[PDB]
Amino acid sequence: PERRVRSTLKKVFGFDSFKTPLQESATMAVVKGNKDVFVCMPTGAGKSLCYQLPALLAKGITIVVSPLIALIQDQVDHLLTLKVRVSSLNSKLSAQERKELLADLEREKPQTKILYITPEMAASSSFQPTLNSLVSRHLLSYLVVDEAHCVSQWGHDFRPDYLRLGALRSRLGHAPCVALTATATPQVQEDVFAALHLKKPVAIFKTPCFRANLFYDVQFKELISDPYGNLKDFCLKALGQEADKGLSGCGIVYCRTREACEQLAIELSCRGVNAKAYHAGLKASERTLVQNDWMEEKVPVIVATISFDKANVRFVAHWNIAKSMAGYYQESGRAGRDGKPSWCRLYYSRNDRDQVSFLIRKEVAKLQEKRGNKASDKATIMAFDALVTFCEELGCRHAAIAKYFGDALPACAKGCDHCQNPTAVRRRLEALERSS
Ligand SMILES: [Zn+2]
């Protein structure tokens, strides 16, 4: 019941109301138990609560399998801080403590409401008697697979144990299963659905990556005579939306190369807008100084490399195409963190695209040399291809981002490069074709 889950959420996690409505629906679906559940919510979006609360309110016990020992310990400690009866069965646990946890499990009603487990030892022969004892007694109310993307090779991070967890789902079938992930491409979604042996009916419960307060546009460097002047104008316009407000908030600028990024920062400083460079090339003390300046209002817009949060960000500009489409989305997510509208820009270049594709080729060659994973090797270049295709698409850029993440394509009434003055973006694309 809705009232029961509401009261349980307030009593356990001290949460008066769910942070998101979609996560509330996901929690309803999981506690219902009629069908398996999937969730793709970004870190810090309450994805944990979706699987924690049903376990709290479940008549049995919920097994939560997570790839890292540290992650398991962090979740268990977080729930213990909430006075929740949780256990952590892992190799890190001692023999006596492990036996005590097993004794707790063997009780008629297991003392540990939520049992976290590391997948590698979950396949261990020692755990299997406990696992099938749990299965026979029908005490396993739910199963949870955190970091579900690890099962898919196409995912950024992969775990073969997560391929095995299809077997664990085959076991304990009576218990509904909840797969959880931070970001999941539709390829990743299908890999998770087929590998974990999840039930035929599943609710994806993925938060729409689209944010109404975002403005995605991809200007062409070759099209603009002085792209640095264009970035100066974009920074000036985005820093202030209210004439009385004037310059406010702060933006971010991303660089493909650390060394050229310092030159970029100094020449934007001379442009009239003060900025600082953040990259490995810069000394650590200076890196911290520029980070602090960005966190404060001292620097209107900061300049950083591809590698790195603020309460409110005015804009996130990408002087060069990001290494991966998901990487570009993550970097642009910093923009529009607050409710105030924010603008995200990407400065394409055919030469820059060739350079980035060469970098991706070197990366995939290194993967083949060491990783030896053809699927992920093709996945990286597929992400780069998706980013570029998003770049040269005479369509809603939010729609393309949603397609890459697989969520239903948003429709931007306004505030999107294509959704307003689309013909202008198409003319820019035609000029790009004319140039190359
Ligand atoms: Zn749009």
Residue numbers in the entry: 12 to 319, 324 to 451
What did the article's authors report about this structure?
Here, we show that a generic and kinetically biased ‘Gembody’ (Gb) interface, previously discovered through trapping in crystallo, can also be trapped in solution by kinetically controlled side-chain-to-side-chain bond formation in a manner that leads to ready generation of complexes; these display ideally balanced interface flexibility and yet relative complex constraints, in turn allowing rapid cryo-EM structure determination, even of small targets. Ultimately, after a survey of in-solution covalent bond-forming methods exploring differing natural and unnatural amino acid residues, we found that Cu(II)-catalyzed oxidation at a pivotal C12 residue site (together with the presence of needed Gb ‘gem’ substitutions previously discovered through iterative X-ray-guided engineering) offered a route to direct and rapid, high-yielding formation of disulfide-linked homo Di-Gembody (homoDiGb) without side reactions (for example, off-site oxidation) to form a robust covalent interface. Furthermore, the success of DiGbs for high-resolution structural solution is enabled by their relatively small mass contribution to the imaged complex while increasing the maximum particle diameter for better particle alignment. In summary, our plug-and-play DiGb strategy improves cryo-EM resolvability and resolution of small proteins through constraint and increased particle size with a simple and robust workflow and can even enable simultaneous structure determination of two challenging targets in one dataset.
To probe the applicability and value of these homoDiGbs to cryo-EM structure determination, we tested the 49-kDa DNA helicase RECQL5 as a challenging soluble target with both small size and substantial interdomain flexibility. Next, a larger dataset of this RECQL5:homoDiGb complex on a 300-kV microscope with standard operating parameters yielded a 3.79-Å reconstruction of the complex after imposing C2 symmetry. Because of minor flexibility within the DiGb interface, imposition of strict C2 symmetry prevents refinement to high-resolution signals. Therefore, we applied an approximate ‘non-strict C2 symmetry’ that improved the alignment of the particle images. In this way, this initial map could be further improved by forgoing strict C2 symmetry, with symmetry expansion and local refinement of RECQL5 alone improving the resolution to 3.18 Å. Current cryo-EM structure determination methods typically struggle with targets below 50 kDa, contrasting with our ready solution of the structure of 49 kDa RECQL5. Further validating these methods, all of the structures obtained were largely consistent with deposited structures, with the only changes being small interdomain movements observed in RECQL5 and its slightly different Gb conformations.
